[PDB]
Ligand binder design. Structure first.
Ligand SMILES: [Zn+2]
Ligand SMILES: [Zn+2]
Length: 219
C-alpha cells in the first residue's frame, strides 16, 4: 500500500465520475493514477491502468459509459487484490473477465472485447494459468475470422468450418464455459442454413451441435 492505495482511491474517484456522465475528468484522474503507478515499480498495475485509460478513451467517449466503468472496476479490483496478497481473488477476477469476454463475443462489441482480453492476459500471465491463456488465443482467432467472414461474402461452408475448427480446439482444451456460447452461435448458424435451401450442410451442423452438447454434459 501507500501508493497502491492512492491508486485505488483515484480509481474510485474515476468510477464515480464515469457513473455520472463526465468522461473527460475520469480520463485525467486515471492519468494521475498512471503517474502514481510509474512510481511504485510494479509493471503489472501500470499496464492495467494504461488499459483502463485507453478504455476511457474508446468506450467512454462514445455512447458506452457502462462498459468503461467495467474496465475501471476490473483494474481497481486487480490493484486491490494486490494490496491484500490474495491469489484466490485474482482467479475470480479472471473468471469474471472471461465471462464478459464471452458476452462481448456473443453480442458483437469489438471495442469492449479488446480491453477485456488485454486485462485477461495481464491477469493470466500473473497467475501461471495456461488453460485460460489457450482459450484466449482460440477466442481471438474465432472472433477475428468471424468478423472477416461477416465483412466479406464468403459462403456458409467457410463459416461452418470456422465453427468446427474452434469447437475441436476448445474440446481438446476442455473449456466448457467457452463452448456454450459456441453452441448458441452454431444454433444461430443452423437457423440461417435451414432458411437457405442448401442441404448436406445442415445435417453436419446438427451432428456437430449434438456432439458438442454431449461433450459439454460430460465436461
Ligand atoms: Zn488521457
Ligand atoms: Zn466443407
Amino acid at each position: 500500500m501507500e501508493k497502491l492505495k492512492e491508486i485505488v482511491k483515484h480509481l474510485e474517484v474515476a468510477i464515480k465520475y464515469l457513473k455520472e456522465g463526465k468522461v473527460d475528468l475520469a480520463d485525467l484522474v486515471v492519468a494521475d493514477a498512471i503517474e502514481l503507478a510509474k512510481e511504485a515499480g510494479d509493471k503489472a498495475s501500470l499496464e492495467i491502468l494504461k488499459v483502463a485509460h485507453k478504455a476511457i478513451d474508446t468506450l467512454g467517449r462514445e455512447g458506452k459509459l457502462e462498459e468503461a466503468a467495467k474496465i475501471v472496476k476490473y483494474a481497481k479490483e486487480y490493484v486491490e487484490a494486490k494490496i491484500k496478497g490474495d491469489r484466490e481473488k485474482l482467479r475470480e477476477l479472471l473468471e469474471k473477465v472471461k465471462k464478459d469476454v464471452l458476452e462481448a463475443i456473443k453480442k458483437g462489441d469489438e471495442e469492449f472485447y479488446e480491453a477485456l482480453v488485454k486485462i485477461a492476459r495481464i491477469i493470466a500471465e500473473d497467475l501461471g494459468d495456461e488453460k485460460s491463456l489457450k482459450v484466449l488465443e482460440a477466442l481471438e482467432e474465432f472472433f477475428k475470422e468471424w468478423k472477416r467472414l461477416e465483412k466479406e461474402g464468403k459462403s456458409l461452408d467457410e463459416k461452418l468450418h470456422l465453427f468446427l475448427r474452434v469447437g475441436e480446439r476448445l474440446l481438446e482444451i476442455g473449456d466448457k464455459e467457452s463452448l456454450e456460447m459456441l453452441i448458441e452461435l452454431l444454433e444461430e448458424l443452423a437457423k440461417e442454413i435451414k432458411k437457405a435451401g442448401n442441404e448436406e450442410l445442415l445435417v453436419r451442423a446438427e451432428a456437430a451441435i449434438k456432439d458438442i452438447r454431449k461433450h459439454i454434459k460430460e465436461l
